[PDB]
Design a binder for this molecule. Structure first.
Ligand SMILES: *[C@@H]1O[C@H](CO)[C@@H](O)[C@H](O)[C@H]1NC(C)=O
Ligand SMILES: *[C@@H]1O[C@H](CO)[C@@H](O)[C@H](O)[C@H]1NC(C)=O
Lengths: 50, 50
């Protein structure tokens, strides 16, 4: 749903730099609030836990 | 020591909340603890905000 979509390239040939939008995807995972779950309602805390 | 309170950067900058944290800075010496490109982005935002 968001913009500036980047992909980790083929790191074995000519790609030694890291994936620059790492903290972007991390912020997506931290802000990922849910209401679904079979075991129960799952939601990430400030440490990324249940 | 006249130590200003610790500014904490949790996620990537939105220029909505991190801008307010940079506006709280009014001391002389700024101690920055991050990576290289994050330091480049923080110095570019500090130059853009004066
Ligand atoms: C997406 O990336 C471009 C180039 O880095 C940048 O100018 C733009 O501000 C980014 N999009 C948003 C909404 O921040
Ligand atoms: C724990 O069990 C109850 C059973 O009704 C369920 O409603 C609840 O969502 C569970 N707690 C979570 C959030 O895992």
């Amino acid at each position: 749903e968001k913009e500036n979509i980047t992909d980790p390239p083929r790191g074995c040939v000519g790609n030694t730099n890291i994936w620059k939008t790492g903290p972007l995807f991390k912020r997506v995972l931290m802000s990922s609030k849910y209401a679904d779950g079979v075991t129960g309602r799952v939601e990430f805390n400030e440490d990324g836990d249940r | 020591w006249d130590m200003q309170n610790v500014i904490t950067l949790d996620t990537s900058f939105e220029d909505a909340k991190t801008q307010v944290q940079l506006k709280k800075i009014h001391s002389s010496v700024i101690l920055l603890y991050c990576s290289k490109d994050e330091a480049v982005l923080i110095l570019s935002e500090a130059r853009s905000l004066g």
